[PDB]
């Protein structure tokens, strides 16, 4: 109890289609729309790095 | 012809014992600390302690 103090409770939304869409171009940038719907149709492969 | 005097020893002294006391100073209060708990809870805590 000596060391404990009230901490600032914060919340942040992360948009994963933005975190992948904004990926630095030293990795291949991609929006999830065009790889989800082909790595299902092929059942195979990869995107990003 | 002379009969000597029959000198006779006195009672033993009462032995006596000495009983002395010891004294030690008054205590000292810690520095008070202010904490995140409303009084009824910190009181149930301290009372338990």
Alpha carbons B34 and B49: distance in angstroms, whole number: 17
Taking an 8 Å cut-off on Cβ atoms, the answer to whether A4 and B33 are in contact is no
For A:1-49, CB contacts with B below 8 A are 1-2, 4-6
State whether A2 and B36 contact (CB < 8 Å): no
What are the b/e assignments for B13-47, b being 16+ CB within 10 Å? eeeeeeeeeeeeeeeeeeeeeeeeeeeeeeeeeee
- Residue B17 structure tokens: 């014992």
For A48, left (φ over 0), alpha (ψ -120 to 50), or beta? left
CA distance B13 to B15: 6
Experimentally determined by: cryo-EM
Q: Number of CB pairs < 8 Å for A and B?
A: 6
Burial class (CB in 10 A: 0-12, 13-18, 19+), A47: middle
């Amino acid at each position: 109890l000596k060391r404990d103090k009230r901490a600032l409770e914060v919340e942040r939304t992360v948009s994963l289609a933005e975190v992948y869409a904004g990926l630095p171009k030293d990795n291949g940038p991609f929006s999830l729309a065009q790889e989800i719907d082909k790595l299902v149709s092929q059942g195979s492969g990869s995107a990003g790095s | 012809l002379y009969l000597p005097i029959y000198a006779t020893p006195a009672d033993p002294k009462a032995l006596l014992s000495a009983a002395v006391a010891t004294s030690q100073g008054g205590g000292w209060l810690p520095e008070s600390f202010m904490s995140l708990w409303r009084f009824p809870h910190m009181l149930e805590n301290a009372r338990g302690m």
